[PDB]
Amino acid sequence: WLTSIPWGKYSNENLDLARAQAVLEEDHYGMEDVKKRILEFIAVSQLRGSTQGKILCFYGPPGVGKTSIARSIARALNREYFRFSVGGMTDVAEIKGHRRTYVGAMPGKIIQCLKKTKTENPLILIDEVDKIGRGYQGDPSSALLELLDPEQNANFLDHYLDVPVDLSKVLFICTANVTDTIPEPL
Amino acid sequence: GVGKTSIARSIARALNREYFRFSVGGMTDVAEIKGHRRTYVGAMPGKIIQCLKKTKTENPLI
Amino acid sequence: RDRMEMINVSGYVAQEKLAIAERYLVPQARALCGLDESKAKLSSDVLTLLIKQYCRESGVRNLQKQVEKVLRKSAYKIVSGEAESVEVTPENLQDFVGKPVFTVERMYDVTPPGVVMGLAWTAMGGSTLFVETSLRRPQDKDAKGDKDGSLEVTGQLGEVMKESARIAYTFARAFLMQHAPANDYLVTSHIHLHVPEGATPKDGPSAGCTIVTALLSLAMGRPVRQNLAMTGEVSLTGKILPVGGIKEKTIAAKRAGVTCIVLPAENKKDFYDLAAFITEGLEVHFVEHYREIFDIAFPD
Amino acid sequence: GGSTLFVETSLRRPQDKDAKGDKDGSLEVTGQLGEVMKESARIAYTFARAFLMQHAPANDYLVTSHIHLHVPEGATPKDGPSAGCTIVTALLSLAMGRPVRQNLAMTGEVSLTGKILPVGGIKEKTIAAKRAGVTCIVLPAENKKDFYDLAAFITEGLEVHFVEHYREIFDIAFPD
Ligand SMILES: Nc1ncnc2c1ncn2[C@@H]1O[C@H](COP(=O)(O)OP(=O)(O)O)[C@@H](O)[C@H]1O
Ligand SMILES: Nc1ncnc2c1ncn2[C@@H]1O[C@H](COP(=O)(O)OP(=O)(O)O)[C@@H](O)[C@H]1O
C-alpha cells in the first residue's frame, strides 16, 4: 500500500496557453468564466514555474457540464483525473480508512485515488459536497477542512496510513447545486 | 479577516520561538486534547504532544 | 472566559485598509502570483475604489480576494496577452474584475417617518441596521376607541429583546404624554416594528434608544435628521446606559457615511480612547437622559 | 436552477361578518415556510396593509379579512425572502380584485417601508423567466449590474423595469 503511493511523482503538465484555450473551446460551449479562471491558473502556474494547485468549486444546476468540464480540464492540463462522491456519507473512515488494526481494514478513498492515479499532482473532483450528513459519529467536515487547508494539506494523513502526504500542487474541484448548504468554513 | 493568525506568526518569528495552530471550532471529542489510551493499537496521543514533537521545544507559540 | 485576558483587535477604516493593502496585501499577492512591481502596478485610488465599493465589512479578506483576482487577470494578460506590463487604473478596473457591487454606501439617505438608523456590534464586526415601524391597523377606527395600540415585533427577537421593546414602548408613550398629550397616536394605534437581526444577543438591548426614537418619529411623522445614528439601553424612565463594542460601532458608522452620532455619556471615555482619523469628522453627542436625544433629532 | 412559481391568495372567511367589525384580518401562510420566511411574510402583509391604507382608504378588505396565501416551495431558504414583492402584489391584486398585468414576473425583498433590496441568483431567475415566455420583468435597481452582465440574447425581448421602492412596482402591475 505504501510503496505503491507516488513520492515526488509530479505528473507533467502542459503550459501552452493557446493550446489549452483551443482544447476547452472545442470540448465545451460558452462557459466563459470557467475558462477565464483556468487560463489564469495556467498562467500563474507557468510564471511561478513549479506547478501548484488550489481549491475552486463549480456551483449550479445539475447536468450542466460540471463533471464534463472537469474532465476536459484534466485532459488539457495532462494531469490525472479522479472523482469521489461524498453526498450522503458520514464515516470519515472511508475518507481516512481505518486504524489498520480492525479486521479487513482499508485506507481512505483518497489513498485509492492516489494509487490508481499513480501520481503526485492529480486532479480530484468531489461530487455533491453540500449533501454531507455530518451526523452522529460523523462530522467528516473536519476531515474535508483539513484536506482543503492550504497548509495542513502539505502533511495530511489518514487512519490506515500514519504518514504525512503533501498535496499543495494537487488540484481540487468541488461540485454542489447550491452554495449555502455548504459549511461556512469550507 | 483581521490577521489574528498572521500576527500569531509574527509573534512566533519575532520571539524566535516556534508556531503551531489548532482548530477546535465545532469540535466535540476530548481525545484530541487528551489523546487516546495508548492501548488501542493505532491510538494516537493528544495533538499537543504532536506539536511539542514537531517544534521540539516546550516554549512554543500554541 | 475569565481564565485569561482578552485583547481586542477590531476593524480597519478605509484609510487603514488602504495602508494595509499598499504595504502588506499587494506585495504578498504579487509574490503569490510570481510577479514584479515593474510588471504589475495598482494606483492607490484603485484600492480606494475597491474598498469603498467592492468590499463591505470590517474584515479585509474579501479585499484580499479582489486584489488577488485582479492580479491573476494581470498575470494571464502578461503570459499571453499583448501587454508586457500592467498599470491598473480606475478605467481598466471594470474589465479587470467587473462592474461595481456596493454602489450604495447606505440603505438610503432620506429616512422616512418611522425609521431610524442604529449601530449593531454583530459577530462579523460592526454594522448599521435600520429599525423601522409602521401602522398595521387604522389609527382611528372610532374616535371614541380607547383600547391601547397593540405592539408587534419582528426580527427573531429573544425574550430579552422583547422586554426591551416593551420598555421602550412604555417610555415613548410617557414621553409623548408629557411632550404632547393631544397626540394619542402612540397610544391608540396598533403598531408593527422591525429591528433587523444579526446583533449579538448581549448587544440586543443597545437598540432601545433607536426603537424609542423611531416610535416617536412615527408618532409625530417628523423624519429623523439625516446622516444620524445612535445606540443606548433605555432605563424605562429616559436615562441611558452604556454599551459595548463602541469602537466597532464607531467604525461601522463612519463607513456608513454618517456624521452626527449619539452615545451614552458613560461610554464617552471609550469613544475618546480611539484614534483621531477614526474619530475625524464625527459630530458626536454624549447624553444621559433621553430628552437630549429628542432635542437633537428634532431641532424644529 | 431557476423556476417560475405562482404565489396565490384567497379569502377563507366571509369578508363582512359584521359591517361594524373591529377585528384584525388574520393571515395564514402555506408552503413549508421557514421562520425567517414567516417573518418576511408578515412584513409584506403589514406593508401591503399600510400601502392600501395610504392609497385606497375606503378599502378595508385587507385590514379585516382572513386571508390564506400559498407560496410554492422550492425556493432555497436564503432566497426565500426574494418573494416579498410577489407576496405584496398578490395581496394588493386580491384586495382590488384587479388581475396583475399578464405575462409579468418580479422578484425582490420588501422592507416594511416599501423599499426593495437586492437578491441573489439573478441569472437563473432571468433564464426561468425567458423560458416562461414572460415579456415584462421587474427587478430591484441594486441588482441592475448583474442583469447587464448577461449576454444580449438572454436579455433579448425582456422589457425590464428596474425599481428601488415598491411604489414604482404598483404603477406597473396596475397601469390603469
Ligand atoms: N456547454 C456545454 N458544452 C458541451 N456539453 C455540454 C454543455 N453543457 C452540458 N453539456 C453536456 O450535458 C451533459 C451533462 O452531464 P454532466 O457533465 O454530468 O453535468 P454536470 O457536470 O452538471 O453533472 C454532459 O454530457 C455534457 O457533455
Ligand atoms: N493590520 C494588518 N497588517 C497586516 N496584515 C493584515 C492586517 N489586517 C489583515 N491582514 C491580513 O489579512 C489576512 C487575514 O487572515 P485571517 O487568518 O483571516 O486573520 P483573522 O484570523 O484575524 O481573521 C492575513 O493574512 C493578514 O495578512
Author numbering:
A (entry chain D): 464 to 649
B (entry chain C): 526 to 587
C (entry chain C): 650 to 949
D (entry chain D): 774 to 949
Q: What does the literature reporting this entry say, word for word?
A:
One of them, ATP-dependent protease Lon, is a member of the AAA+ family (ATPase associated with various cellular activities) and is responsible for selective degradation of unfolded, oxidatively damaged, and short-lived regulatory proteins, which prevents their toxic aggregation. Functional hLon is structurally organized into homo-oligomers consisting of six identical subunits. Following its mitochondrial localization, Lon’s NTD specifically recognizes and binds protein substrates, which are then unfolded and translocated into the enzyme’s proteolytic chamber formed of the ATPase and protease domains, where they are degraded into small peptides. In this study, we investigated the effects that phosphorylating two Lon tyrosine residues, Tyr186 (found in leukemia cells) and Tyr394 - the only two found in its NTD - might have on the structure and function of hLon and the effect of polyphosphate on hLon’s stability and activities.
Other hLon mutants were produced by exchanging Tyr186 and Tyr394 for glutamates (Y186E; Y394E), thereby mimicking the negative charge introduced by phosphorylation (hereafter “phosphorylation-mimicking” hLon variants), or for phenylalanines (Y186F; Y394F), which acted as non-phosphorylatable controls (these mutations were introduced to verify that the effects of phosphorylation were not due to the loss of functionality occasioned by the removal of the Tyr hydroxyl group). The Y394F mutant’s basal and stimulated levels were lower, however the stimulation rate in the presence of β-casein measured for Y394F was almost the same as for the wild-type. Quantifying the protease activity with FITC-casein showed that the Y394F mutant had only about 50% of the wild-type activity. Similarly, the basal ATPase and peptidase activities of Y394F were lower than those of hLon WT. However, the effect of substrate binding had the greatest stimulatory effect on the ATPase and peptidase activities of Y394F. Altogether, this suggests that the Y186F mutation is largely neutral, while the Y394F mutation has some downstream effect on the ATPase and peptidase activities, which is largely corrected by the binding of a substrate. Cryo-EM maps were obtained for Y186E, Y186F, pCMF186, Y394E, and Y394F with resolutions ranging from 2.9 to 8.5 Å (based on the 0.143 cut-off of the Fourier shell correlation curve). ADP could be clearly resolved in the Y394E, Y186E, and Y394F structures. Structurally, only the pCMF394 substitution had a large impact: the cryo-EM structures of the ADP-bound forms of the Y186E, Y186F, pCMF186, Y394E and Y394F mutants were all very similar, while the pCMF394 substitution destabilized the formation of the ATPase-protease hexamer.
